[PDB]
Design a protein around this motif. Structure first.
Motif: not given
Ligand SMILES: [Cl-]
Ligand SMILES: [Cl-]
Lengths: 135, 133
Positions: B6, B99-101, B106
């Motif tokens: 990430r 890796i939206e967070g 997240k």
């Molecule tokens: Cl995430």
């Protein structure tokens, strides 16, 4: 216990910790360890990322400054280790041998001059201490 | 999905942005300062357990714990300031990358998630272990 990096470190404290000189020298060794760890991470991170935004000459200069400073920190780590172990072997050499950790805080006989093994050893010690931090 | 994976994706997505890069250098610095402080504090306690009586040791421990809390608050702040910036500015690239967070996992109503101090240890240890020899 004493087979591990962490075990040998805890035996060194138990054996030498009442000697104020040994105590200060060991505090200094751990500090030289965190300094080297910090310089390596700071550098590695910048090498990973600085390329996405610095031109070649800027990057070259930065790389050299970080590089030289990291190497100096590594030499200080090595010197701190050697100085500390020479002291504790001089003063508590018999007790150390009896405890299964002859030669002091470093798990090697063979690699105590090895730049990269000393760096590996420091990583293991510092990681172990951090991971075992009290709740 | 890993701490290191990430982190790598975050650099790829945001590396070109000087404001992001500066804030991330800040977070990495705060992380190393935290790690260093914890190690030095734990060393002090390990050495001191043999030199101090239980009252003295409890007072030391309380001093160190308070200082640790205050440094932990500082780490949290660096992470938040960085992550809120990238989530606001690169939200869809982050979504697209899985890796939206942002740089930290997240939140989840389903399971626990990694403690920040544990995450920082993972990230910094990972960078150290993978260094150029
Ligand atoms: Cl995430
Ligand atoms: Cl040995």
């Amino acid at each position: 216990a004493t087979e591990t990096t962490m075990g040998r470190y805890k035996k060194v404290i138990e054996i030498t910790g009442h000697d104020e000189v040994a105590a200060k020298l060991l505090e200094g060794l751990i500090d030289a360890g965190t300094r080297y760890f910090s310089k390596v991470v700071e550098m590695e991170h910048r090498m990973a990322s600085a390329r996405f935004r610095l031109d070649g000459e800027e990057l070259r200069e930065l790389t050299e400054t970080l590089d030289r400073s990291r190497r100096l920190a590594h030499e200080s780590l090595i010197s701190s280790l050697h100085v500390f172990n020479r002291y504790i072997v001089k003063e508590y050499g018999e007790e150390l041998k009896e405890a299964g950790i002859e030669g002091g805080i470093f798990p090697k006989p063979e690699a105590n001059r090895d730049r990269i093994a000393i760096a590996d050893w420091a990583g293991e010690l510092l990681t172990g201490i951090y991971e075992n931090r009290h709740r």
